[PDB]
Amino acid sequence: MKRTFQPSTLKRARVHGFRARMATKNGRQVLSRRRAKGRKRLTV
């Protein structure tokens, strides 16, 4: 049976990557929200 997660590293970086967040203000709010919490990862 096919499952929901079919990995692809190129489609991963283009949707959730660092340069994708920085392109819009709503993604820039996500990054500043994750910096205030102290997240070690900070991006996909």
Interface residues with RNA (CB under 7 A) are 1-3, 5-10, 23-25
* C-beta closer to RNA: residue 10 or 36: 10
- Count, in order, helices (H) and strands (E) of the chain: 3, 0
* C-beta closer to RNA: residue 2 or 37: 2
Task: Find the shortest distance in angstroms from Cβ 41 to RNA.
Answer: 14
Q: Maximum Cα–Cα distance for the chain, whole Å?
A: 41
> Is the Cα torsion angle 29, 35, 36, 40 positive or negative in sign?
positive
Task: Find the shortest distance in angstroms from Cβ 29 to RNA.
Answer: 10
